[PDB]
Structure formats: structure tokens, C-alpha cells
Write an enzyme that holds these catalytic residues in place. Structure first.
Site, PDB file in Angstrom:
ATOM      1  N   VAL A 292      -9.427  21.218  15.119  1.00  0.00           N
ATOM      2  CA  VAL A 292      -9.819  19.910  14.150  1.00  0.00           C
ATOM      3  C   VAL A 292     -10.000  18.770  15.361  1.00  0.00           C
ATOM      4  CG1 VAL A 292      -8.834  18.475  12.469  1.00  0.00           C
ATOM      5  CG2 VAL A 292      -8.183  20.793  12.516  1.00  0.00           C
TER       6      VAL A 292
ATOM      7  N   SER B 118     -10.295   8.354  13.944  1.00  0.00           N
ATOM      8  CA  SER B 118      -9.725   7.126  13.330  1.00  0.00           C
ATOM      9  C   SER B 118     -10.284   5.966  14.039  1.00  0.00           C
ATOM     10  CB  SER B 118      -8.301   7.020  13.170  1.00  0.00           C
ATOM     11  OG  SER B 118      -7.671   6.107  12.421  1.00  0.00           O
TER      12      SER B 118
ATOM     13  N   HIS C 213       0.031   9.394   6.811  1.00  0.00           N
ATOM     14  CA  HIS C 213       1.086   8.845   7.603  1.00  0.00           C
ATOM     15  C   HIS C 213       2.256   9.923   7.340  1.00  0.00           C
ATOM     16  CE1 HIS C 213      -0.530   4.855   8.446  1.00  0.00           C
ATOM     17  NE2 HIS C 213      -0.409   4.528   7.345  1.00  0.00           N
TER      18      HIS C 213
ATOM     19  N   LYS D 239      -0.028   0.583  -5.841  1.00  0.00           N
ATOM     20  CA  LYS D 239      -0.114   1.031  -7.516  1.00  0.00           C
ATOM     21  C   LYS D 239      -0.962   1.906  -7.723  1.00  0.00           C
ATOM     22  CE  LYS D 239       1.082  -3.844  -7.920  1.00  0.00           C
ATOM     23  NZ  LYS D 239       2.364  -3.332  -8.119  1.00  0.00           N
TER      24      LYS D 239
ATOM     25  N   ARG E 253      -5.018  -7.124  -0.074  1.00  0.00           N
ATOM     26  CA  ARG E 253      -3.712  -7.988  -0.053  1.00  0.00           C
ATOM     27  C   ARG E 253      -3.188  -7.822   1.230  1.00  0.00           C
ATOM     28  NH1 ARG E 253      -1.781 -10.105  -4.998  1.00  0.00           N
ATOM     29  NH2 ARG E 253      -2.889  -9.430  -6.873  1.00  0.00           N
TER      30      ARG E 253
HETATM   31  O1  LIG Z   1      -1.748   0.926   3.626  1.00  0.00           O
HETATM   32  C1  LIG Z   1      -0.915   1.873   4.174  1.00  0.00           C
HETATM   33  C2  LIG Z   1      -1.036   2.921   4.522  1.00  0.00           C
HETATM   34  C3  LIG Z   1      -0.535   3.766   3.584  1.00  0.00           C
HETATM   35  C4  LIG Z   1      -1.615   4.855   3.336  1.00  0.00           C
HETATM   36  C5  LIG Z   1      -1.735   5.576   1.891  1.00  0.00           C
HETATM   37  C6  LIG Z   1      -2.886   6.279   1.351  1.00  0.00           C
HETATM   38  C7  LIG Z   1      -2.951   7.064   0.166  1.00  0.00           C
HETATM   39  C8  LIG Z   1      -1.843   6.915  -0.754  1.00  0.00           C
HETATM   40  C9  LIG Z   1      -0.605   6.319  -0.382  1.00  0.00           C
HETATM   41 CL1  LIG Z   1       0.810   6.188  -1.360  1.00  0.00          CL
HETATM   42  C10 LIG Z   1      -0.613   5.568   0.905  1.00  0.00           C
HETATM   43  C11 LIG Z   1      -2.896   4.245   3.556  1.00  0.00           C
HETATM   44  N1  LIG Z   1      -2.604   3.415   4.840  1.00  0.00           N
HETATM   45  N2  LIG Z   1       0.188   0.861   4.432  1.00  0.00           N
HETATM   46  C12 LIG Z   1       0.730  -0.487   4.178  1.00  0.00           C
HETATM   47  C13 LIG Z   1       1.212  -1.096   5.185  1.00  0.00           C
HETATM   48  N3  LIG Z   1       2.306  -0.352   5.452  1.00  0.00           N
HETATM   49  C14 LIG Z   1       3.073  -1.040   6.319  1.00  0.00           C
HETATM   50  N4  LIG Z   1       2.690  -2.328   7.017  1.00  0.00           N
HETATM   51  C15 LIG Z   1       3.530  -3.108   7.771  1.00  0.00           C
HETATM   52  C16 LIG Z   1       4.869  -2.666   8.292  1.00  0.00           C
HETATM   53  C17 LIG Z   1       5.429  -1.304   7.421  1.00  0.00           C
HETATM   54  C18 LIG Z   1       6.804  -0.896   7.400  1.00  0.00           C
HETATM   55  C19 LIG Z   1       6.969   0.091   6.730  1.00  0.00           C
HETATM   56  S1  LIG Z   1       5.236   0.396   5.570  1.00  0.00           S
HETATM   57  C20 LIG Z   1       4.715  -0.760   6.624  1.00  0.00           C
HETATM   58  C21 LIG Z   1       2.094   0.860   5.763  1.00  0.00           C
HETATM   59  C22 LIG Z   1       1.536   1.880   4.761  1.00  0.00           C
HETATM   60 CA   LIG Z   2      -8.141   4.783   9.986  1.00  0.00          CA
HETATM   61 NA    NA Z   3      -7.331  17.761  17.538  1.00  0.00          NA
HETATM   62 ZN   LIG Z   4      -3.785   1.925   5.187  1.00  0.00          ZN
END
Ligand SMILES: O=C([C@H]1C[C@@H](c2cccc(Cl)c2)CN1)N1CCN(c2nccc3ccsc23)CC1
Ligand SMILES: [Ca+2]
Ligand code: NA
Ligand SMILES: [Zn+2]
Ligand SMILES: O=S(=O)([O-])CC[NH2+]C1CCCCC1
EC number: 3.5.1.98
Length: 367
Positions: free
Chosen positions: A186, A190, A134, A24, A263
């Protein structure tokens, strides 16, 4: 005081990933509105980001991938189904109205921040719309299309021999690690949940390759880590990284999906526990780019990033929230700070110390 520059475009909260999608962008607007109502605008420079150009994005991403992102729309998806498959767009990385503009504004804030740091016009730059760790060179992943972090690090590498990246999102910062896996210019660090968890990477034993061997650092964790446990490993690890690596600039991904009550995430950090990471990194007095990241309980994302902006400004702010345009979101308590839950911490003291000891052994391998 250290100077802080902060990036925000008032349209960022209008981009919509689609009904039922947990990401969101509105959470960035909630964050902005809360910190405005706390008065933090009085103490920092606030800028609108430019729309990052194709030229800027292709400093890392492939031309074909960027051209596709610039082309794809809800109304023409039928014509692009094979490219959608190749570039992994259309499902968890959906096609939405203004997708490319969203990428441009997210990225713009990060690269502009990096330029400010390079020009020594600021000590810290903040872009809560960034942190898209990612995204890969030629494909979207995990809700992320353009890797603003990699692009910002490439900007810093113009002026800085050694850049440190730190990622406290609950997910492994895989796209950033991958981009720099074979260079010592770099170091990526993590901290993330690990064990059949997205994205599946960031094993303890992934330490880099080639000239990059020992310049990737991964601290895998289990559910329920708390402020005490996290604090006891973050400060020592970053202290040892600082001592051995001696970077001249730092990028900190401040993903808030590592907070209690998220969540999607299953950690148990408070806003104070999370923000302690910002305080520790600040003690090293290095040019610092602070970026956003995940977070799916949006009231707590706004709290987290508001408090971390205050930390950057060395400004305490009251726990009592000021009236704001989203005030009802912060019930039932209307406080800034959050309590941890009663969830079990699966990370034993001995587990945490043993992993830390393995990471210390790897860091001692630096020159
Ligand atoms: O929180 C994140 C990532 C997103 C990242 C971030 C940061 C800033 C702006 C934005 Cl637009 C995105 C921060 N970490 N994710 C939620 C869980 N998700 C999945 N979980 C299980 C399974 C699967 C299968 C496909 S995606 C997924 C992967 C992505
Ligand atoms: Ca991390
Ligand atoms: Na490196
Ligand atoms: Zn995340
Ligand atoms: O609050 S405000 O400055 O009007 C927001 C500006 N939004 C920009 C997003 C990219 C397209 C151009 C307009």
C-alpha cells in the site's frame, strides 16, 4: 459508462455525537437527499450497507478494543472508566447511543464497496459515511473509532498486489499511514495542513520504514491553499505516483474539511477544486473506492459529495439546486458551487514547487 455503486443507510444521520460536538452524521443524510433530488439515483446502484461484524473489524483492530466498543454505553460509562482511558473514548471520541451501530454501518459500506470492486461488479464504489482515517488498531482518535479505510484496503489486498490510498481531508491520514507504514503493498499519499495541527504527523520526511520505505508520501501545506495551487501539485504528484507505483486499485478519502468556509479547516478550495481530485484519479481507469471524511460546514459537505457523486457518474448537474428536504440550509444563494474567500494563501508558488520536487526525488527511488 463506468459503473457506480453507492452505500447508504437511512439511519446514519440519526447517530448524534452530542451537544456542541462539530461532527454531524446528519450531513450524510443531507448529501443523500440532495443527490436524490438531482436524480442521480437513476444512474447508479444504491445499496444499504450491512452492519460490519466483530469478525470483520478484528481483521485490523484488536479483539479487546472491538469488544469494548460493543459494550460501552451512556448508562454504563461509570463501570468502564479505566477502559475508556485505555481506548481513548469519552471526550472528543464521545460515548453516544448507538456508537457501535454507527461504526458497523460506516465500516460496512467501505468493506462492501471493496468486495464489489474485487468481484469486478463495479468500477467505482462510494461510501460517504466512511473515511475514518485517524482510528488506530487499539484506540479511538480524532472522532474516529473503527478504521473503515484500513479494513477496506485489507479487503482489496486480497486481490490486488498494490493498492494506492489518497487522502485530501485537511488532516493527515495518520491511522491509514501507520497501518501500512512498513509495507510496499500500500502506498499512502496524504495532502494536509501541517504545523502544530491535528494530528501532528505527516511531515515531508515521513516516507515509510523497512520494506515500506518510500511508500508513504506526505505533502504538508499551509493555510489558505486555493484551487489553482492545489491543482498544480495534485495532478503531477498523482501522475508520478501512478507511473512509478503502478497500483491496480485506488482508495480516495474525500474529506470536505479542506473546503473554503469550513468551520474547523483553514483551506480555501471550492467544490470544483476539490472534485478535480476525483476527476484526476478517474483518468487512470483503476477500480476506485471513494470515501467520505471530515467537513463541518454541513451545507458545503452536502454540495461537495453530491458534486463528486456526479463526477463519478460522468454527469453534469446544474448549479441551481433542486428543491430538497434541507433546502433552507443552502441559502442565501441556493447554488451547488461555492466561491473562495479572500483569505491569504500562505503556500507560495516556490514553496509548493520545492515540496513537489522533494516528493519527486523520493518517488524516483522506487524500483
Ligand atoms: O476533521 C477531523 C478528522 C476526523 C475525520 C473523520 C472522517 C470521517 C468521519 C469521522 Cl466521524 C471523522 C476527518 N478528519 N477532525 C477535526 C479536528 N479534530 C481535532 N482538532 C484539533 C484538536 C483535537 C483534539 C482532539 S480531536 C481534535 C480532529 C478530528
Ligand atoms: Ca489528508
Ligand atoms: Na506503505
Ligand atoms: Zn479532517
Ligand atoms: O431506511 S432504513 O432502511 O429503514 C434504515 C435502516 N437502518 C438500520 C441501522 C442498523 C439497525 C437496523 C436498521
Amino acid at each position: 459508462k463506468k459503473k457506480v455503486c453507492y452505500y447508504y443507510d437511512g439511519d446514519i444521520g440519526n447517530y448524534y455525537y452530542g451537544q456542541g460536538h462539530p461532527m454531524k452524521p446528519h450531513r450524510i443524510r443531507m448529501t443523500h437527499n440532495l443527490l436524490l433530488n438531482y436524480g442521480l439515483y437513476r444512474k447508479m446502484e444504491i445499496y444499504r450497507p450491512h452492519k460490519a461484524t466483530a469478525e470483520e473489524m478484528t481483521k485490523y483492530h484488536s479483539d479487546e478494543y472491538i469488544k469494548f466498543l460493543r459494550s460501552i454505553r451512556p448508562d454504563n460509562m461509570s463501570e468502564y472508566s479505566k477502559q475508556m482511558q485505555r481506548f481513548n473514548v469519552g471526550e472528543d471520541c464521545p460515548v453516544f447511543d448507538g456508537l457501535f451501530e454507527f461504526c458497523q454501518l460506516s465500516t460496512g459500506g467501505s468493506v462492501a464497496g471493496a468486495v464489489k470492486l474485487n468481484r469486478q461488479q463495479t468500477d467505482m464504489a462510494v461510501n460517504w459515511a466512511g473515511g475514518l482515517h485517524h482510528a488506530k488498531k487499539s484506540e479511538a482518535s480524532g472522532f474516529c473509532y473503527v478504521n473503515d479505510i484500513v479494513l477496506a484496503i485489507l479487503e482489496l489486498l486480497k486481490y490486488h498486489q498494490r493498492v494506492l490510498y489518497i487522502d485530501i481531508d485537511i488532516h493527515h491520514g495518520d491511522g491509514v499511514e501507520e497501518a501500512f507504514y512498513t509495507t510496499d503493498r500500500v502506498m499512502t499519499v496524504s495532502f494536509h495542513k501541517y504545523g502544530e495541527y491535528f494530528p501532528g504527523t505527516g511531515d515531508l520526511r515521513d516516507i515509510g520504514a523497512g520494506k515500506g520505505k518510500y511508500y508513504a508520501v506526505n505533502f504538508p501545506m499551509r493555510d489558505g491553499i486555493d484551487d489553482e495551487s492545489y491543482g498544480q501539485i495534485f495532478k503531477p504528484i498523482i501522475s508520478k505516483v501512478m507511473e512509478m507505483y503502478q497500483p491496480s486499485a485506488v482508495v480516495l478519502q474525500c474529506g470536505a474539511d479542506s473546503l473554503s468556509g469550513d468551520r474547523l479547516g483553514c483551506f480555501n478550495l471550492t467544490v470544483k477544486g476539490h472534485a478535480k481530485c476525483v476527476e484526476v484519479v478517474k483518468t487512470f481507469n483503476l477500480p476506485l473506492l471513494m470515501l467520505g471524511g471530515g467537513g463541518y460546514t454541513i451545507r458545503n459537505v452536502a454540495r461537495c459529495w453530491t458534486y463528486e457523486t456526479a463526477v463519478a457518474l460522468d454527469c453534469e448537474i446544474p448549479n441551481e439546486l433542486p428543491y430538497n428536504d434541507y433546502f433552507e440550509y443552502f441559502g442565501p444563494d441556493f447554488k451547488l458551487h461555492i466561491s473562495p474567500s479572500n483569505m491569504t494563501n500562505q503556500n507560495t508558488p516556490e514553496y509548493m514547487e520545492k515540496i513537489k520536487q522533494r516528493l519527486f526525488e523520493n518517488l524516483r527511488m522506487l524500483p
